[PDB]
Amino acid sequence: LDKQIKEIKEVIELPVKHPELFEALGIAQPKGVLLYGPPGTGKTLLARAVAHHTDCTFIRVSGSELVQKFIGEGARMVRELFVMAREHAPSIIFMDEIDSIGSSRLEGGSGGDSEVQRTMLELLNQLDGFEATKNIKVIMATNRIDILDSALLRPGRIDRKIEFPPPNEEARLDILKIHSRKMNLTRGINLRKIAELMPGASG
Amino acid sequence: LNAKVRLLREELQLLQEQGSYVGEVVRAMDKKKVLVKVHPEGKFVVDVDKN
Amino acid sequence: ASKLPLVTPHTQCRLKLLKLERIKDYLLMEEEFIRNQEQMKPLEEKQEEERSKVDDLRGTPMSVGTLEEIIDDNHAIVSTSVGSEHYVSILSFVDKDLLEPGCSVLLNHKVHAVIGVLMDDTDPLVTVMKVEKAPQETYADIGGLDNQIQEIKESVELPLTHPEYYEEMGIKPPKGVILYGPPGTGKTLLAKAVANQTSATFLRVVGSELIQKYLGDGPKLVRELFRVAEEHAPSIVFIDEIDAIGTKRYDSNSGGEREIQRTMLELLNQLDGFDSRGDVKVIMATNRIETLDPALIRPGRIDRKIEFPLPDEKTKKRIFQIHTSRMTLADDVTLDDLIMAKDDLSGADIKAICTEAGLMALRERRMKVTNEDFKKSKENVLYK
Ligand SMILES: Nc1ncnc2c1ncn2[C@@H]1O[C@H](COP(=O)(O)OP(=O)(O)OP(=O)(O)O)[C@@H](O)[C@H]1O
Ligand SMILES: Nc1ncnc2c1ncn2[C@@H]1O[C@H](COP(=O)(O)OP(=O)(O)O)[C@@H](O)[C@H]1O
Ligand SMILES: [Mg+2]
């Protein structure tokens, strides 16, 4: 996942350490990244890793009611979490979309229409020029971008999109070598054949 | 040794006196007065010791 | 303490001088009168003796309580923090003018008598929807429109800055303004410019959060919003994407589609109820105006309707001029070729193309921008 690492570094790490480098070209610093791909291909760990290396307080919201008591007493709105974000200025907000959301009916198509989507719509509408403090970023992880509503696909809203294709032979072999280190192995495994015996899988 | 014995003897009388509550401070006010909250009761407006 | 506002001479005229001299003489004589008693019959310090007596009267702890009902002859029913309530009296040093139902009051520890009244502690909401600082630069950044800018200025700025033109002809300024048009053409941008220029308190709220998850919460939120907007000052209320409440439906909503109707009726009342409105201006904006209720837009609630059309090629050139003002642009590029890259591109595509080209040049650790960067940027942003 080296190319994805480079692409996310250009829009996360750079506009914190060297803002003047972006001011030299006189363009606004990006604030929106969207990651898309099949489930289990390594999106959430990547967001966690980049937030770890840049030293940013990694915050994520799932809209549950257990944690609500920490955000506020009633929290009629949803923007109230900014009251807690700006105290840890270099912060990142993460949001995840459920694996099953259709367009016909049932999940996604019927019942509800967005949930996570309306949350990012509100958040981006906030920090589009009305926000004073800087160094706040937003990320999602969804599959099948074609189902996103049109209000979120406007050319000026999302700054970057990144795709996570299912691994090929080399990626499967590397993941296997990474994850077999935790076990007591034996001299000579020839796990190349093991990788070649698994096809069209996930990481 | 005499000092430690005297202290041990006085400990019994010292320990008999009353306890003290624990609270959470909301925000301060004028002239050395603050506002505090004790969890199973309502909030109080209290004064501050000289130290 | 607002002794005399009639200083309209505002010059070295003998009238103002004589008025000031007489004011000084009156003040000196009253000072002598109010000092003589402290020099002849003090009977107490009266600077700290009374304060010491008052502090002695009230105990060192004092608890907070909620008023529920007050009788004129200095007593009331106060609910303690636990909930049991009493029939205590009222002292005289409590300045009985802030006595209102629901305000936290300071009661004595022993007899629970009302000794003081307490100021409140803001609200969580106010911070959520109070704009603090002006976002960015004023109308000089817009370009292209130049026509409805004067209309907005007539509605919001002119009634406040020069409230003399209207009084000569005796009219009330137009009340409501709504902005409609295709997406991505510069409505929120005009709102930002007004927010930067203006001097009143600016309140912003999106339409997608007017719908709640319980019963009867929506009308409550609307009422609280206009109460906050009313109780401060001359202010501006900005509501964005109203149609979002009539287009998308959420399963998290406890009711069905009728609670949306209840929220709508509440909003209509708040815009044109029979209470005295006061001094509040409303700005609304949407891109699907053929769906919302025509009873919400009748004259007397919304008086001005402004359409934002697609940009023309002159405005396209002006926008490209604006958005590459501080870019180290090479001499090879030409904007004319980019003008008709797409037949009906809007304002946002220009900024998208410029920023993406800048990023692509940033990758190669460069400073200038060449043609092939723009050529690839347009394909990256437009053709998916
Ligand atoms: N007339 C214009 N002059 C200058 N910039 C413009 C103009 N129209 C669009 N833009 C650019 O496009 C961006 C999009 O603006 P904005 O989102 O406020 O538009 P909008 O049409 O009100 O949006 P929406 O309908 O999606 O709420 C602006 O921030 C600006 O960069
Ligand atoms: N590219 C990868 N390399 C190594 N391990 C991976 C990779 N992708 C996934 N994993 C492992 O598989 C798990 C998949 O979970 P995750 O990647 O968070 O799913 P998703 O990204 O779809 O939310 C991770 O916890 C990680 O331990
Ligand atoms: Mg808008």
Side-chain angles (χ1 to χ4, degrees), chain C residues 187-188 240-241:
Chain C
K187 312 176 271 282
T188 308
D240 210 0
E241 296 104 322

Short mmCIF file of all heavy atoms in Angstrom, two decimals, chain C residues 187-188 240-241, ligand 3:
data_model
loop_
_atom_site.label_atom_id
_atom_site.label_comp_id
_atom_site.label_asym_id
_atom_site.label_seq_id
_atom_site.Cartn_x
_atom_site.Cartn_y
_atom_site.Cartn_z
N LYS C 187 -24.01 31.20 -3.65
CA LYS C 187 -24.96 31.72 -2.67
C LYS C 187 -24.34 31.83 -1.28
O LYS C 187 -24.36 32.90 -0.66
CB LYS C 187 -26.20 30.84 -2.63
CG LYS C 187 -26.76 30.51 -3.98
CD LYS C 187 -27.93 29.57 -3.87
CE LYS C 187 -27.48 28.13 -3.91
NZ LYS C 187 -27.15 27.68 -5.28
N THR C 188 -23.77 30.73 -0.79
CA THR C 188 -23.10 30.77 0.50
C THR C 188 -21.95 31.75 0.49
O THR C 188 -21.62 32.33 1.53
CB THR C 188 -22.61 29.38 0.88
OG1 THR C 188 -23.69 28.44 0.77
CG2 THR C 188 -22.10 29.36 2.29
N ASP C 240 -29.81 27.53 5.78
CA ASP C 240 -29.25 27.04 4.53
C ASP C 240 -29.77 25.65 4.21
O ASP C 240 -29.91 24.80 5.10
CB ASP C 240 -27.73 27.01 4.61
CG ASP C 240 -27.08 27.23 3.28
OD1 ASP C 240 -27.81 27.40 2.29
OD2 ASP C 240 -25.83 27.21 3.22
N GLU C 241 -30.04 25.40 2.93
CA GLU C 241 -30.66 24.16 2.46
C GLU C 241 -31.88 23.79 3.29
O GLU C 241 -31.89 22.81 4.03
CB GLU C 241 -29.67 22.99 2.47
CG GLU C 241 -28.50 23.12 1.54
CD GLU C 241 -27.24 23.47 2.27
OE1 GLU C 241 -27.33 24.26 3.23
OE2 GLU C 241 -26.17 22.94 1.91
MG MG D 3 -24.47 26.68 0.21
#
